[PDB]
Amino acid sequence: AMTLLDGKALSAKIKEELKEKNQFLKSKGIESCLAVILVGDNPASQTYVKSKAKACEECGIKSLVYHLNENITQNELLALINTLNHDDSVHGILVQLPLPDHICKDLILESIISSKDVDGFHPINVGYLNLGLESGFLPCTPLGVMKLLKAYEIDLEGKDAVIIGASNIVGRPMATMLLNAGATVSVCHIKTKDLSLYTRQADLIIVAAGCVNLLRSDMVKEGVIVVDVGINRLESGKIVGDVDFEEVSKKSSYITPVPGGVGPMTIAMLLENTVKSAKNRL
Amino acid sequence: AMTLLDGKALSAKIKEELKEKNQFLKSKGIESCLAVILVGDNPASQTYVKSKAKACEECGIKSLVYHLNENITQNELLALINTLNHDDSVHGILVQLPLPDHICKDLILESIISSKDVDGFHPINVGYLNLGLESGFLPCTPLGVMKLLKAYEIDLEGKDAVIIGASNIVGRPMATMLLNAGATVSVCHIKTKDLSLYTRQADLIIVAAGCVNLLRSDMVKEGVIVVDVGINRLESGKIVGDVDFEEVSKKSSYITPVPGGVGPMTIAMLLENTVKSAKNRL
Ligand SMILES: [Cl-]
């Protein structure tokens, strides 16, 4: 039996739950508010910001989008975040990546007040998660994967999990959450000698490589759980992930489709982290 | 052709380097100082603290030992740490583990100011390492292994590494440093279904699980590099590690002995992190 991990349906349910929560919060004087900072006119990044703003409106979160020029200085971005850090009506601060070459990503993300770091990228929020303390802000993409697996009651302790990709956005916090859940984790990347050596043994595979058809049926055992984080656009217009879905799904017990899988869960956790920040301010 | 990873020999060379650094720092008015907080009367902890204070004296580090009552309250311990936090003459603050049962270790370690956290346990220093940055302090035990492996010119890029144990002291920061160095890392523990599936393919094994003879010769391939962090006392009083040394060393290209391996390297990094903090005053 194979089951699709329908992140699209789960994300819509979470949005409906947050809309109800925000109505109760609004009736008590708290209007959940997320500030999104976009530096530049990148067409893809503008699409991501519109998706977040549209998702905020659907669950009652007030959106503050700052479209800044590509040529703005690092000090001007720091000044805006400092103003947002002390704005009590703002509960979440998200900086859309990537930033221009003349603006240091590490300095900008650390300047966000950790109590509004809904992306979970501040060093102290990374440290909290790595210490097994899942109380603070968790990165949205791996958190959405965990919430999607929990929605199907996927028991994770003892499972052999393989993480393909070791980025701060997905890979590293993903392996930490799985490790916190009692699973055995293997972190692979572009320097791994034999990727199929690890994937052939895995009970759970999370692919965040950004490569079309990286995961094939050859490298998969029967009953594997496959989580596809990739969002790749074919030149034929079709959106696909990092997994050969048509063949890998035939050997999978659970698998995320693309589109409709991890994508919507990443946005839902952003809204959830925002409402969490607003609810912790009563 | 097994080669012993002589941590005792490398540690003595590091202390000689620190002795020259402290003579220079003292000439600039900087007397490197480490404060050690010992709570209770655990006989093993007393021995470790004396060993630390002795190692400080050998390389020109001023040691301050604070011996607190076993029944000290949590806020009383926090008050001392706050005093040491604002003491400009103190460059490093270490809390000897284990603390009494009525003391929350995580809350105590987070109260240490991160610029004097020579153990690298503060959440923001854990975050810096997990983000791939070396701006903070690194935990002494995994840092010592990295320095020990570097001294023997062992290339870690692309190597299949397996870490057994996932503690905040050793296992988790070790996997991050190996991942930052470009190795493929697998974190195993008590919930792993079959440790041998991971260890038999490993080029490098870090064992820190607190169990005698956990790593056997038949769980290992020829040419493996073995690092034994375990310090276990048998019924006879003999100190051994987590590795069956007699059998595993026959298949190992490099292996740490116990004693004389990771142990002295852990203390050497404590001293080195303290001189590193004192150098920041320059
Ligand atoms: Cl602007």
Ligand SMILES: [K+]
């Ligand atoms: K790859």
